[PDB]
C-alpha cells in the first residue's frame with residue numbers, strides 16, 4: 660500500500676543487485692525512491708535517453724535546477740556525481756556521469772561512476788554508459804555487480820536487452 664522505496668517485480672541477481680524490464684520514469688513514479696540515478700553528462704544537459712525522460716517527467720524542473728547548479732559550480736568530472744532534488748519522482752536525484760566511449764572517454768571511469776552508488780543505501784538506477792554512451796551493457800552490468808555494495812534496483816527499458824542481460828548473467 661503506501662510505503663516509499665517499495666520495489667516490486669525485480670529479479671534478484673546477487674545479494675544487493677536487482678533488475679527489471681521497466682521504464683525508470685514509471686518505476687520512480689510508482690516507488691518514490693529515496694534516490695533515483697540519472698545517466699547524466701558532465702554538463703547535466705538532459706537531452707535524450709534516461710536524462711531526457713526524467714527531466715520531461717519533472718516538467719523541466721530538473722533542467723532548470725541543473726542549469727543553475729552547473730552555472731554556479733562548473734561541469735562535473737567524468738566518473739563523478741552530484742545529489743540534486745528528485746522533484747516529483749524521488750527524494751533525491753543522484754546525477755552520475757559514466758564515460759562516453761563513443762567520444763573516446765576511458766572505460767575505466769565506469770567503475771568510478773558506479774562507486775558513487777556506494778554512498779546511498781538504496782537506489783533506483785539505469786545501467787551506466789549503455790545506449791548512446793556506447794559501452795557494452797553486459798560489461799556495464801558486470802561492473803555494477805562487482806563495484807556496488809549497496810542495494811541497487813536496475814530498470815532496463817528494452818525487453819530484448821533485459822532478456823540478454825538475465826540469460827548471460829544467470830549462465831555465468
Ligand SMILES: Nc1ncnc2c1ncn2[C@@H]1O[C@H](CO)[C@@H](O)[C@H]1O
Nearest residue numbers: 682683698708709712789790814816
Ligand atoms: N526510460 C528508460 N528507463 C530505463 N532505461 C532506459 C530508458 N531509456 C533508455 N534506457 C536505457 O538506458 C541505457 C542508457 O542510460 C540504455 O541501455 C538505454 O536503452
